[PDB]
C-alpha cells in the first residue's frame, strides 16, 4: 500500500486497484470561443494547470495504473442534450451552434478535443458524457467494477462543476477518492479553494485532497 | 403557468408537472446525537429553517403539488452501507452504531425519521437513500418520468452535501430546479452562502435560487 499525506488524514492506494480520472481538459472549456466562453467566462484561468495534469498523467502511466479521460459532449443530432441545458442561460451561441472551433459541445468537432499534451494514448478509457457528472449515462460504474477498481485519484476542470459532481457521485458509489487540488481549476476564484475545502469537510465527507508534489513523494 | 422571480432570472412552471423535493429533514441531522453530531458538527444551524420548510410543504399541498422526502438511511444489516462510508472519518460512533436515539442512519430507528413538524401524509413520495445523492441507487427519476414531472423546487438539508448533490445530478438528467434558499442549511453558514451561488452562476448553470417570499408571491 502507499500511503500519502493528504486532507483531511493520510491517504492509502494500491496503483493495481486504482484509477486516475481527468475531467474534461477540452478545448471547450480551456480555450477562447467554445462553450466556457460561451456561457460568459473568462477561460483564462484553466490552462495554467496543463503542465501540472500532465505531470499527473506521466505519474499515472508509470505507475501502470488505469486512466479514465472523461469529455463533455453531444451527439451531432443532439439526441441525448436535454432541452433545458440547450436553452439555460438565453446564450447567444449555445450548444451545437457555430463557434470558431466548431459546433460548441458536440462530439467529433475540434473545439470539443481533450487538449494534445493531455490527450488518451491505447488503453486508457475514453467516456463522453452528456452531463456535469462523469457516472450519468456513462458505462464508467460497470468499467471500473470490472476491472476491481476502489480507489480514485481525480483531477480537471471545473473545480465546482464537473470535478465536485464526478467526485460526489464516485464518493456515493464507494470509492476512495484523492483529489489533486493543482491539478484542478475553476472560472472563479471564488469557487476553487471552498470546493476543496468542502469536499474534505467533516472528517473527508466525500474525500480526501492534496497536491501533486505529495503524491509524486508517495510514487 | 406560475412566474417566479428568482436569480439569475425568472423561473416559470407548471404545478401539475413540478414537484417539491424535501431533502433529508431527518432526526439524525438536526438533533444533537445523531450522525450530523457523530461526524463531529454543531447541529443547531439547521433548526432555524424549520418553519419555513413547514411553509413550503403546505404551500405544495395547497398547489396539489406532488411532494417528495428523502431520507438518507441505510438497511438494518447495512448491506447497503459501502465500507467506505462506514470507516471514514473514523468517528468514535459511526453507522450502525447506537447513540441517544438509536442505531445512527439506520431505517427504522428513531434518529432516523424525518421530523415530525415535517412528516409526510398520503399520496407523498418518501425515498430511502444510501447516499448524498436523492437519484443515486433509488427510483426517484423513474416515479418522475411515470408522472411527467419536468420541474422540481427544492429544499433540505444540507445545503452543501444532499441538497447540491441532488439538484446537480436533476440537472443533469434535465429537470429544471428552483432551490428555496431560506429552506436549505448548512452546519457551514459560508459552505450554505457559496454554494447557493455556485448552484446559479454563468446564467443559471445547474438552476435557479429565490427565498419563500417570491415562491408565495407567484401563487398569491
Ligand atoms: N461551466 C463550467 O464551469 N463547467 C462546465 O460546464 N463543465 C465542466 N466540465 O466543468
Ligand atoms: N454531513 C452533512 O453535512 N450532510 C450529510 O451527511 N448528509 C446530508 N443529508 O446532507
Same mark, same amino acid.
Given at each position: 500500500?502507499?500511503?500519502?499525506?493528504?486532507?483531511? %488524514?493520510? %491517504?492509502?492506494?494500491?496503483?493495481?486497484?486504482?484509477?486516475?480520472?481527468?475531467?474534461?481538459?477540452?478545448?471547450?472549456?480551456?480555450?477562447?470561443?467554445?462553450?466556457?466562453? $460561451?456561457?460568459?467566462?473568462?477561460?483564462?484561468?484553466?490552462?495554467?494547470?496543463?503542465?501540472?495534469?500532465?505531470?499527473?498523467?506521466?505519474?499515472?502511466?508509470?505507475?501502470?495504473?488505469?486512466?479514465?479521460?472523461?469529455?463533455?459532449?453531444?451527439?451531432?443530432?443532439?439526441?441525448?442534450?436535454?432541452?433545458?441545458?440547450?436553452?439555460?442561460? /438565453?446564450?447567444?451561441?449555445?450548444?451545437?451552434?457555430?463557434?470558431?472551433?466548431?459546433?460548441?459541445?458536440?462530439?467529433?468537432?475540434?473545439? /470539443?478535443?481533450?487538449?494534445?499534451?493531455? $490527450?488518451?494514448?491505447?488503453?486508457?478509457?475514453?467516456?463522453?458524457?452528456?452531463?456535469?457528472?462523469?457516472? %450519468? $449515462?456513462?458505462?464508467?460504474?460497470?468499467?471500473?467494477?470490472?476491472?476491481?477498481?476502489?480507489?480514485?485519484?481525480?483531477?480537471?476542470?471545473?473545480?465546482?462543476?464537473?470535478?465536485?459532481?464526478?467526485?460526489?457521485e464516485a464518493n456515493?458509489?464507494?470509492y476512495?477518492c484523492?483529489?489533486?487540488?493543482?491539478?484542478?481549476?475553476? %472560472?472563479?476564484?471564488?469557487?476553487?479553494?471552498?470546493?476543496?475545502?468542502?469536499?474534505?469537510?467533516?472528517?473527508?465527507?466525500?474525500?480526501?485532497?492534496?497536491?501533486?508534489?505529495?503524491?509524486? $513523494?508517495?510514487?
Open positions: 500500500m502507499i500511503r500519502i499525506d493528504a486532507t483531511p %488524514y493520510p %491517504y492509502q492506494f494500491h496503483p493495481r486497484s486504482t484509477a486516475l480520472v481527468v475531467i474534461d481538459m477540452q478545448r471547450d472549456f480551456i480555450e477562447e470561443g467554445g462553450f466556457g466562453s $460561451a456561457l460568459g467566462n473568462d477561460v483564462r484561468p484553466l490552462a495554467a494547470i496543463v503542465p501540472t495534469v500532465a505531470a499527473l498523467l506521466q505519474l499515472a502511466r508509470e505507475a501502470g495504473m488505469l486512466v479514465v479521460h472523461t469529455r463533455e459532449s453531444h451527439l451531432p443530432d443532439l439526441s441525448d442534450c436535454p432541452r433545458s441545458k440547450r436553452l439555460r442561460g /438565453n446564450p447567444t451561441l449555445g450548444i451545437g451552434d457555430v463557434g470558431p472551433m466548431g459546433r460548441i459541445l458536440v462530439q467529433g468537432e475540434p473545439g /470539443n478535443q481533450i487538449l494534445p499534451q493531455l $490527450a488518451p494514448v491505447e488503453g486508457e478509457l475514453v467516456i463522453d458524457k452528456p452531463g456535469k457528472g462523469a457516472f %450519468y $449515462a456513462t458505462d464508467l460504474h460497470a468499467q471500473l467494477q470490472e476491472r476491481r477498481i476502489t480507489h480514485l485519484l481525480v483531477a480537471g476542470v471545473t473545480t465546482e462543476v464537473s470535478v465536485q459532481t464526478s467526485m460526489r456515493d458509489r464507494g476512495e484523492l483529489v489533486i487540488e493543482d491539478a484542478c481549476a475553476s %472560472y472563479f476564484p471564488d469557487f476553487h479553494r471552498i470546493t476543496l475545502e468542502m469536499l474534505t469537510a467533516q472528517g473527508g465527507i466525500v474525500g480526501w485532497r492534496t497536491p501533486l508534489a505529495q503524491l509524486q $513523494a508517495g510514487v
